[PDB]
Every structure is written in structure tokens, then in C-alpha cells.
Design a protein around this ligand. Structure first.
Ligand SMILES: Nc1ncnc2c1ncn2[C@@H]1O[C@H](COP(=O)(O)OP(=O)(O)O)[C@@H](O)[C@H]1O
Lengths: 801, 223
């Protein structure tokens, strides 16, 4: 309440004539900025918002509550001066202009201005423009804490200064940094926005000094001895600059204290944790008394929708053929009606994010292990969506151009063979002409198929990106459930995507899978999908595996690139990091449960491109970065819990075997070793999604290359038609496969259903053996043991003979 | 007429383009270049639509738009990573003959940077790798010319050396980094310096490994 009074007085000082409505407006704005600022969930926020206006009307009748209490309550001194109330849109335009200028200065990564960012920018600016105006920020990682803090600090002229924590970060290092920042703030009269994350706040040794600095205004005893003498010596020059001649040591120390209090604002960024925040309160009260705290958690639906709209403006997503379905599935209430195709795609992206929230909450209710889902994952998802869309569109355009070139070449050769007929050979020439006409009609059909794929590309890429970015930590069954939910949603929205889409085939090709199988990567479907995850990533992948096949596979894959192994526990880890960070080689890292926060700059991909040099701030040391640097984090323990900070900077790759993964693996092995015809038909069905088509296109390219050697010699026997009969029978075979695909699907489904109980028995038996370790410590069994038993049953079985 | 007016405006725009291109590349500022490009674009947009429909105006507008989109490549090339060896190398690949002292933005704008984007980006990455290695060599030199032995008095009888652990960690860090630096093919440049530094580091390693044992035995037998 005393800060309430101070805020009202500060707002009323430059103004001289105010009706009662203005006073009530200022009072309500201060109530919003002091009480509802610190709340966590939506119900309490609504309670506070309604009670403020209820109290205002109860204790102040006869006034017009509309002007006095307006829902978009906002105050700023940027528009004109004197802390005048401002409408949201004018401030939006001003922030857009200043953010553009900021872009030309620093942090070229774009920002999307939804209402929440505007409010938080206003709050941070209000807190900064205040002596000893320290700030606490509580919110989920990636919500825009450090970015907005730095933006507001730069806007108000505050020079940001953030310490980089690492392993063996002794207290003396923080003492030296504190001395440096205090000298920079007080002595040189340079205002500082000092930003601290939670990684360095974990140790309680630093928090006591920071508590003293917060409360007293400057921690006593940080300067002592010759360093204290240098402090006073430079403080004399500081007083020289300001014309405040003083000679006694204590009085100039007090002047340094005043300068520090007036010119140092410290912003804390802390992840939401009830027990963690309780411990912080236990070790320090001034973090809640001296520091005013602002809560902003997960982005609202409007924020997600606006970010998706702004980050999908570059892509086409414009289908004039798209219609509006009846009962459009809307997760954003402010969608245009009727919506455009891009509108529907962004709505589907928002729905994907929200349904992953719902799935995570349900799995938490069930009692399993859950990983945090943050808006940084949403940005990663939208980046994967853009990249896959562009890549697939470029491939389709190149393939269509190749087909057009082939068609023109065939037309020219038809004209040439007509000219050569102008002059048994004639019958062969007629056969060649008919054959070329048939192949031309086939390429027209191929062009129609190209149009169909160009239609389905948008939804297919959306689902593929949603899988590659969001999922990865859940087991096979949960991945399938999420993919089915996304497919059903896109089916509701009339967004065209292939109904039998296969994730493994559309995100890779034959050569990559063959190379993976060359390394120690088993043909299990989970392993292939997670190899897909490992090939494409924006955030560095974190692999979890109780078996350790991941490490061998990933070292074999990158063995040609001088990959190295390193653990966190090894004291040379920083050592190895620096090497891999400058000489340009991948470095797989193990035992991530003992995570070292020193990797935070690397995972964040924050680099500084200055002086003809790219620099990474590895701890307190700046290191040259090489473009060929991919880092993989690994762990053998599969039940370990990760902090939300780590969970929001890496994509999880799960290799744990569950009741659904082993079931599918054993069913596939049964089909392969017992019904080879059914397994062959299933493989043909799976390869029909491009692989056969890719072979056909490669073969027609080979025909193009052979026909380019024509020179009249194409009529050696006047039938080069044998090669195109090979093509024609191959095309007839693939056409037959496509026509009868439904019958193949049905037969494979029936055979797999018949063989399923054996797979369920296999999974249950293996998990019973695995959980026998609780009966006695001697009963320890491995998955390879069960696979040996299973092979001894399937092969070398006398009874089956 | 209107054609004469648009021809005069085109001549003025071309004169402005030539004047900004006469600035030598040594004295060109990428940020100011981008600002001037934006100003020229704004000036072009101020022309009437009748003058804007002319083919020559469209050609100049698209040329300046190409300059705008390659401004990022100009910024990347305007590093110190380029040295002159990479400039010589790109000269050899692009088969152009320039003078480093007489180098200005004009000749390189005549060269299609967009068409040669792959080569330019390869040159940039090569330059960044070589600068990483050279900066590492500068760092090792400056730490190993400024490192001092931590001498401490002993019983008023001698002045022994402490801090063996930190010095040994530094030596092993540097020897392993240099040994791993043989890979990363960019090592083909600055190889004799690397070999000399490795030899010096190995000499330090052996000398101080013997030194620590001598000091320990001597202090024990002294006691
Ligand atoms: N309004 C926004 N529009 C677009 N991107 C944003 C916005 N806010 C934050 N981001 C992105 O999300 C990230 C948020 O990081 P931040 O939350 O500051 O890290 P930390 O969780 O350590 O505080 C930034 O890298 C930024 O690129």
C-alpha cells in the first residue's frame, strides 16, 4: 500500500487538473499493477479484476465507470510525456517502430506484439523508471522473459549485463563480477540492467550476497584492501565528474552507495516452481519485499495464434479452392468467419499446441513422467513447418520442371521420328511412335499426380512438422494417438492430407535408411522414426536410451566427422567443449542428469557476429564458433527428471521400450519369419508412398538420358522401344499396386490381427522378466535375453519342422 | 515528353548509382550503404506510375532490389575473416581481375553475387574457420607469453613453486587442443606455427613433470 501511495503521487505530480474519473483511473491502474500483477492462474486474476471495479463503484458513486474503469487499462510516458493514459493501438505502433530500430541494432530475431507482450513491456518499463526498482519475473521458459527485459532495458538506455554460470563457478568469481558491475554502475554513472537466471541462483552462497545488495542497496565488504583503495581512487574521479567534491572516505563511499542505488536495476528470471519459490523465500525475503514480481506464464490462445500468423506469412498457404467446413473446429474464438486457408492452418497449429498440453496433463493425471511444453517448442514447431513446406515445395517444383523438360524432349523426338519416316523398318517406326504416344499419356497422368501432391503438401507438411518438433518423448502408442488426433482435426477442417501418410517414408528416402541400417540401428519402427528425429533438428537433440544402441549408432554415423565422446562428470568436459566449439567437430555428451548450465549459450544458439568473427560466450570466455558443430546430449537412465529450462531447449528422442513398442517389434518379426508373403506385401504398401514413384521417375530420367543420344542412330533396329516397354510394365505394376491397395491393407490388417496375441504374450513375458528384479536381486534379465529366447522359438525349433 | 522526363530521371538515378559505387570498398559502410539503398528506393517510388511503367525504370528498380537482397552478403564479405588469401581464392574461382588497393564496390556489384552465392558462402565459411584457428593461435601465444610461475617463499630458505594443478590443466588443455587441431582440414594453413607450438608445449610438459618430482623429493629430503 505504501508503493500504491507512491505510485499515485508519482502519476499525479506532473498533472495539475484532473476530474475524479482520472483519479479513479490512476487508482485502478495502480491496483492492477500492484495486486493482480503477482497472481498465477486465471480464476484469481478474474476475481481481482472484478473486485477492483466493484470496490471503485462501491466507494465512488455518481461517476461514470466507463471512463473511470476501462478494461484495456494502460499508462505510459512514451506517447507525449507526463504518464498520460494511452490507447493500446498507438502504443502498439510506437513499440513496433522502436522494435524495428532495436532490430537494426541488436537481436535480429523477430518479435510478435500481442497484448501480453505489450503489457509486460509496460510493466517492466514502469519498474525500471524507479530508484532501486528491482524486478522479479516468474514464468515458464521461453515466454519472453529475458528478451522483453533486454528490450525494455535498451529502450530506457539501460545497458544489460548478465553473468554466465558454469561448473566450479566459485563464489570468488561472483565476487569479482559483482565488483566489476558495481564499479560500472556507481563509479562511471552508467545505468545497468543486471539480469540473473535460475541456474546461477541455485547455489545459496550467492543468494546471501545478492540479498544484502538488494536490501542495503550495496553489499558491504565486497571491496576490501587494495581493491577497496582502487574503489575510492576511482570514486574520487567519479565525484570529480559530477562536481560533488568530497575527501573523507566514508562520505564518498556513501556517494557511491547513492549512485549504485540510483543506477542499478536487477531483473531475476525464475521458472515457476512452488517448492522452489518457497525455498527462495526461505533463503531470501527481499526477493519478495524489495523485488516487485511479475507473473506471465504460458501464452494465451490469442498470442499463439498471432505468432503463428506472423511466422507463416512468408509461406504460400493460399488455396483459392479451400472451402469453409460446417462446424469449423475453432480453438481461437476470434477467427475470421469465413476463414481463409492460412487462417485454418494457423488455427490447426494452435490446436496442435493445445492438444499437446491436454495430452501432457492427462498423462500427468495417469501418473507417468511428463516433460514441460513451452512456447519455445511452438516456435521450433513453426520453424520446422516452414522448412519442411519450403523443402517439399522446392522438390515438387524441381520434379515438375524435370517432367516438363522430358515432355518437350519427347515431343521433339516425335517430330524427329516423323521426319525420319518422311523419307520392316516402317512398322518398327510406327510401333515406336505408338509407344512414345503411350509414354506421353503416362507423363500427363504423372502431371495430374503432381497436382494432387501439390494439393496435399500443406497438410502433410503440417502433420510431419508437428510430429518432428512436438513429439519425441512419448512412447510409440502416445505418438500414434497424437498423430491420429492431428489427422482427425485436419480432416475436420477440410485440409488436404494423404489419409495413409507414413512418417518414416515422407521424411527420408531409401539411401538414408540404408545408411542407418549400416550402422547399429535396428529396423524397429520406433528407431527409424527417432532416426528421422535425429537427422532433422533445430534444437540439439537429447537422446534417452536404457540400451545404449543410440551411442553406438550416432558415433558410427558421425565417425567420418571425427566425433568424440565426453561426459559431464569428467573434469575435461569444458575442455572438450571448447575444442568441439572451435575446430568444427561433433561431440556426443553422456550422463545429462548432472547437467552443466555451461551449455546454455550453446543450446540457445545465441551468437555474436562482430569484428569479422562469430563468438559464443562459453562461460566467461568468448570462443570462436564453427558452422559444422552439432552436439548430442545422451543419458542411460530413462526415468530421470529434467528441469524446465533444459526441457525447453532440446528435442527429446526416446529409445525406451514400452508395452507398445516391443509388441509392434515382435509382431513385425512374426510376420517376417512366418508369413513372408504378407510381410512383402506390407513392405510394398509402405514403399508405394514415393519409393516406387521415385524409382519410376529415376527410370524415366534414365530414358531421357539415353534418348539424348539420338543422332538418327535411335533407329538402329527402329525399336529402342524395349527400354520403354520396361518402363511401361513397371508403370503397369505400380498402377496395379495402387489400384488394389485397399485389399492389401485389409489382408495385412487381418493377418496382423490374427498374429497379435502372440505379440501381446511376448511383451507381457518380457516385462514380467524385467520386473522380476524386485523379487530377488539375482533375477536380472536383459532385452537381448528375451530376444534370444524369441529367436530360439522362431528359428531352430524342432516342433515347427 | 513523358519519355524524355523518364529518361532524365533514369539518368539522374544512374548518376547517383555510379556516385555511390565510386566509393572504394575499403571505405564503404554496409549500414550506411543499406540506408542509401533504402533512400534511393524511396526516391524511385516517388515517381509517377506512368514513369514507373517504363521498362528501364523496372530494370533499375530490380537491380537495386537485387543490391538490397545481397546487402547481407556484402555485410558478410565486409568482415576481417576474408584476409586476402580468401579474396585471392575467390578471385581465382570467379576469374575476375581486380586490384586490392583500387578495389571498390562497383566491380563486385558487376559480378553476380546471387548467381555465385554457393561459392561466396563457401569462401565465407572457410574464412571463418581459418580465423577461428588463427584466433586460437593468438590466444595460446598471449596466454603463454603472460603466464608466470606462482612463486612462494619457503622457510626463508628458498622460493618454491605452487599451483601445479592449474598449470598442468592448462598445459594438457593446450596440448590436446593443438593435437586435435591437426584435423579440421583448415589446418593446411598455419601448420609450422602449430608444430612449433606443439613442440614447445611438449617441452613444457616434460620439463615440469620432472620438476614437480624433483621439488617433492627435495622438500621431503630437506625436512
Ligand atoms: N512476442 C514474441 N514474438 C516472437 N518471438 C518471441 C516473442 N517473445 C519471445 N520470443 C522468442 O522466444 C524466446 C524467449 O526466450 P526467453 O523466455 O527470454 O528465455 P528465458 O526462458 O531464458 O527467459 C526468445 O528467444 C524469442 O526469440
Amino acid at each position: 500500500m505504501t508503493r500504491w501511495v507512491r505510485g499515485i503521487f508519482e502519476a499525479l505530480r506532473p498533472l495539475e487538473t484532473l476530474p475524479v474519473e482520472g483519479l479513479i483511473r490512476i487508482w485502478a491502474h495502480e491496483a492492477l499493477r500492484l495486486f493482480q500483477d503477482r497472481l498465477v492462474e486465471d480464476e484469481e486474476r478474474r476475481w481481482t479484476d472484478e473486485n477492483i471495479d466493484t470496490v471503485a463503484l462501491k466507494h465512488f458513486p455518481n461517476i461514470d465507470r466507463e471512463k473511470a474503469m476501462s478494461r484495456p487499462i494502460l499508462y505510459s510516458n512514451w506517447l507525449s510525456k507526463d504518464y498520460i493514459p494511452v490507447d493500446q493501438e498507438e502504443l502498439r505502433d510506437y513499440v513496433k517502430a522502436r522494435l524495428k530500430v532495436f532490430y537494426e541494432e541488436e537481436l535480429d530475431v523477430p518479435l510478435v506484439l500481442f497484448n501480453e507482450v505489450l503489457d509486460h513491456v509496460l510493466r517492466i518499463d514502469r519498474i525500471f523508471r524507479q530508484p532501486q526498482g528491482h524486478l522479479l519475473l516468474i514464468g515458464v521458459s521461453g515466454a519472453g522473459k529475458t528478451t522483453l527485459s533486454r528490450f525494455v532495458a535498451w529502450m530506457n538506455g539501460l545497458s544489460v549485463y548478465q553473468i554466465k554460470v558454469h561448473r566450479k563457478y566459485t563464489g570468488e568469481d561472483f565476487d569479482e563480477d559483482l565488483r566489476t558491475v558495481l564499479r560500472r554502475s556507481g563509479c562511471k554513472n552508467e545505468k545497468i540492467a543486471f539480469i540473473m537466471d535460475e541456474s546461477n541462483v541455485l547455489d545459496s552462497g550467492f543468494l546471501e550476497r545478492m540479498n544484502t545488495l538488494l536490501a542495503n542497496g550495496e553489499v558491504p565488504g565486497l571491496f576490501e584492501g587494495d581493491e577497496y583503495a582502487t574503489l575510492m581512487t576511482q570514486c574520487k574521479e567519479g565525484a570529480q565528474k559530477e562536481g560533488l567534491m568530497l575527501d573523507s572516505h566514508e562520505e564518498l563511499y556513501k556517494w557511491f552507495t547513492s549512485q549504485v542505488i540510483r543506477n542499478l536495476h536487477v531483473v531475476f528470471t525464475m521458472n515457476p516452481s512452488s517448492e522452489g519459490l518457497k525455498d527462495r523465500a526461505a533463503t531470501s525475503p527481499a526477493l519478495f519485499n524489495r523485488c516487485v514480481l511479475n507473473w506471465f506464464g504460458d501464452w494465451s490462445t490469442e498470442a499463439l495464434y498471432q505468432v503463428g500468423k506472423e511466422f507463416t506469412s512468408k509461406m504460400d498457404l493460399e488455396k483459392p479452392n479451400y472451402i469453409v467446413p460446417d462446424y469449423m473446429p475453432v480453438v481461437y474464438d476470434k477467427l475470421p468467419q469465413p476463414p481463409s486457408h492460412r487462417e485454418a492452418i494457423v488455427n490447426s497449429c494452435v490446436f496442435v499446441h493445445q492438444t499437446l498440453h491436454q495430452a501432457n496433463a492427462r498423462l500427468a493425471k495417469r501418473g507417468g513422467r511428463t516433460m514441460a511444453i513451452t512456447p519455445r517448442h511452438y516456435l521450433d514447431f513453426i520453424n520446422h513447418y516452414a522448412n519442411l513446406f519450403h523443402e517439399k515445395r522446392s522438390e515438387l517444383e524441381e520434379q515438375q520442371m524435370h517432367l516438363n523438360v522430358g515432355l518437350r524432349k519427347i515431343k521433339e523426338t516425335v517430330d524427329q521420328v516423323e521426319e525420319l519416316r518422311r523419307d520392316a523398318k516402317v512398322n518398327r517406326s510406327t510401333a515406336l511412335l505408338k509407344s512414345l504416344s503411350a509414354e506421353r499419356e503416362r507423363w500427363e497422368k504423372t502431371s495430374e499426380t503432381f497436382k494432387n501432391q501439390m494439393s496435399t503438401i500443406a497438410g502433410d507438411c503440417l502433420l510431419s512438422a508437428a510430429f518432428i518438433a512436438y513429439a519425441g518423448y512419448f512412447d510409440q502408442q502416445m505418438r500414434q494417438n497424437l498423430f491420429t488426433t492431428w489427422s482427425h482435426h485436419l480432416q475436420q477442417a477440410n485440409i488436404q492430407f494423404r489419409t495413409d501418410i507414413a512418417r518414416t517414408e515422407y521424411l527420408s528416402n531409401a539411401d538414408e535408411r540404408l545408411r542407418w541400417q549400416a550402422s547399429s540401428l535396428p529396423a524397429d519402427d520406433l528407431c527409424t522414426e527417432n532416426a528421422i528425429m535425429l537427422k532433422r533438428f533445430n534444437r540439439y537433440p537429447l537422446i534417452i536410451d536404457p540400451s545404449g544402441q543410440a551411442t553406438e549408432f550416432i558415433m558410427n554415423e558421425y565417425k567420418d566427422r571425427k566425433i568424440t565422446r565426453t561426459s559431464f562428470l569428467d573434469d575435461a568436459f569444458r575442455k572438450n567443449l571448447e575444442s568441439a566449439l572451435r575446430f568444427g567437430n561433433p561431440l556426443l555428451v553422456q550422463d545429462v542428469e548432472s547437467y552443466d548450465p555451461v551449455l546454455n549459450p550453446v543450446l540457445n544458439r545465441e551468437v555474436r557476429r562482430t569484428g569479422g568473427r562469430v563468438l559464443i560466450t562459453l562461460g566467461d570466455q568468448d570462443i570462436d564458433l564453427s558452422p559444422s558443430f552439432v552436439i548430442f546430449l545422451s543419458t542411460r537412465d530413462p526415468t530421470v527428471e529434467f528441469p524446465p529450462d533444459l526441457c525447453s531447449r532440446v528435442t527429446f528422442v526416446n529409445f525406451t521400450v514400452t508395452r507398445s513398442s516391443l509388441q509392434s517389434q515382435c509382431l513385425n518379426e512374426v510376420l517376417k519369419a512366418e508369413r513372408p508373403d504378407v510381410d512383402e506385401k506390407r513392405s510394398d504398401l509402405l514403399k508405394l508412398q514415393g519409393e516406387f514413384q521415385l524409382r519410376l521417375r529415376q527410370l524415366e530420367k534414365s530414358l531421357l538420358q539415353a534418348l539424348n543420344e539420338v543422332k538418327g542412330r535411335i533407329l538402329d533396329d527402329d525399336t529402342i522401344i524395349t527400354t520403354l516397354e520396361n518402363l511401361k510394365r513397371e508403370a503397369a505394376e505400380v498402377t496395379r499396386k495402387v489400384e488394389e491397395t485397399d485389399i492389401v491393407m485389409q489382408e495385412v490388417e487381418t493377418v496382423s490381427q490374427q498374429y497379435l496375441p502372440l505379440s501381446t504374450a511376448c511383451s507381457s513375458i518380457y516385462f514380467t522378466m524385467e520386473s522380476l528384479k524386485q523379487i530377488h536381486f539375482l533375477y536380472q534379465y536383459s532385452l537381448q535375453f528375451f530376444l534370444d529366447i524369441y529367436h530360439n522359438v522362431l528359428y531352430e525349433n524342432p516342433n515347427l519342422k | 515528353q513523358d519519355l524524355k522526363g523518364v529518361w532524365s530521371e533514369l539518368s539522374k538515378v544512374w548518376e547517383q548509382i555510379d556516385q555511390m559505387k565510386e566509393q572504394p570498398w575499403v571505405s564503404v559502410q554496409p549500414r550506411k550503404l543499406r540506408q542509401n539503398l533504402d533512400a534511393l528506393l524511396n526516391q524511385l517510388k516517388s515517381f509517377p506510375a506512368r514513369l514507373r511503367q517504363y521498362a528501364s525504370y523496372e530494370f533499375v528498380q530490380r537491380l537495386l532490389k537485387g543490391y538490397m537482397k545481397i546487402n547481407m552478403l556484402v555485410i558478410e564479405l565486409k568482415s576481417e575473416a576474408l584476409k586476402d588469401r580468401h579474396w585471392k581464392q575467390l578471385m581465382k574461382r570467379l576469374h575476375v581481375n581486380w586490384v586490392v588497393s583500387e578495389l571498390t564496390l562497383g566491380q563486385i556489384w558487376d559480378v553476380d553475387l546471387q548467381k555465385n552465392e554457393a561459392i561466396v558462402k563457401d569462401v565465407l565459411l572457410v574464412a571463418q574457420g581459418e580465423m577461428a584457428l588463427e584466433e586460437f593461435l593468438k590466444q595460446i601465444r598471449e596466454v603463454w607469453n603472460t603466464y608466470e610461475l606462482d612463486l612462494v617463499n619457503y622457510q626463508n630458505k628458498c622460493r618454491l613453486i605452487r599451483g601445479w594443478d592449474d598449470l598442468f590443466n592448462k598445459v594438457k588443455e593446450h596440448i590436446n587442443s593443438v593435437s586435435a587441431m591437426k584435423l579440421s582440414p583448415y589446418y593446411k594453413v598455419f601448420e609450422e606455427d602449430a608444430l612449433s607450438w606443439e613442440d614447445k608445449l611438449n617441452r613444457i610438459m616434460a620439463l615440469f613433470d620432472v620438476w614437480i618430482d624433483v621439488q617433492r623429493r627435495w622438500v621431503y629430503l630437506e625436512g
